[PDB]
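Researcher: Last one for today. Full complex below.
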Amino acid sequence: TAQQLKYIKDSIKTIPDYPKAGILFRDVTSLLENPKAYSASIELLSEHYSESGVTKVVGTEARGFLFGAPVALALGVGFVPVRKPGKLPRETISESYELEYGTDTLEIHTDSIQPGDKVLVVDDLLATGGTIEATVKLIRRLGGEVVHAAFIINLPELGGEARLTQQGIHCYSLVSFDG
Amino acid sequence: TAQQLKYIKDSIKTIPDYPKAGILFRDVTSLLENPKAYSASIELLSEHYSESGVTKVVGTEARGFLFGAPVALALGVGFVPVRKPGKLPRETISESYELEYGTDTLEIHTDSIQPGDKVLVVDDLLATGGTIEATVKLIRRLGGEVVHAAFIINLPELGGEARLTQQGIHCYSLVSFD
Ligand SMILES: O=P(O)(O)OC[C@H]1O[C@H](OP(=O)(O)OP(=O)(O)O)[C@H](O)[C@@H]1O
Ligand SMILES: O=P(O)(O)OC[C@H]1O[C@H](OP(=O)(O)OP(=O)(O)O)[C@H](O)[C@@H]1O
Ligand SMILES: [Mg+2]
Ligand SMILES: [Mg+2]
Ligand code: NA
Ligand code: NA
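Model: Here's the assembly. Have a good evening.
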């Protein structure tokens, strides 16, 4: 099983000086194009929550779609996107979050979460945690419970794991990197 | 399976007056939230291409990610995203195309397609075909072969099916609204 976590971690490329000089980017697209690593990653996430009682999966636009939706399929429960603004056609609510250079919002359909839903949030990557903190507020405003957030990659030095742990969320990541 | 296509079709909500007055929007998110409809749509798409010899699946950001990637996982081939600009970190090429109110681009990683790749394109929705024509140009510039494009929903009145058929693309759509 280490076999597998190892094959998943090796499949992810590290790009130097991206997005800027000095900084490393962990590129999930190289996992996406290795069908062994990709299927293993969805198999691990879905087996870990198999007995969790989750009734909805939420995945945040856009890379989170590529993990949240296969997990939802493997679990046999509904998938609910949280999207960038102006894309969801039915009635929505919104939360604002901080980017490096200003602020943006995420939206969810109000009809798609309801009281008593047990919601697993899935994203490719956990860094500062701003994205998921916003997503978790969307879900809780509609009466969903979130106690679990799952990721392919964690960069615990950026603080997101500690930040989400403090907000009642058990973070589960397949691999992690540091400097 | 008629039974199944009807279940998929009825799972998709029609939204009146979106994005504006007079216009109808087919909302695939109601399908995503019905696990039976969702898994069935992925089952039909992957089984249709099971013997096609496909080596890569491309899905265009963002809604195509929701159908191209599960299709890739079912075929057991790699998935390659085509993205909005500035999101892909390795070397890319780019293709410009028309929106209603101006011009945008789609990018692809140059290392993710090679000569002799056999590439299925998957998207949620075929309307005018603009998006997919651009996508296809990305793939072909890298030596990739594309002869199939697949969709959940086709809106043939908007001309995309015919447009793409003209470009050597065989279009396969689960359902149609008219
Ligand atoms: O934990 P945080 O610091 O919020 O960072 C993690 C988030 O950032 C990235 O998304 P991004 O908005 O760059 O783009 P994408 O998902 O559209 O590719 C990644 O996909 C996570 O959603
Ligand atoms: O056949 P065409 O006329 O090009 O239209 C079809 C495309 O338009 C929509 O994309 P959009 O950029 O609104 O957003 P999304 O995929 O990010 O939701 C849809 O998902 C298809 O990609
Ligand atoms: Mg993201
Ligand atoms: Mg699209
Ligand atoms: Na609700
Ligand atoms: Na190439």
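Strands of chain B lie at 13-16, 24-27, 56-60, 78-82, 92-99, 102-109, 118-126, 145-154, 170-176. The pocket of PRP (ligand 2) is lined by residues A 87; B 60-64, 123-131, 160 (CB under 6 Å).
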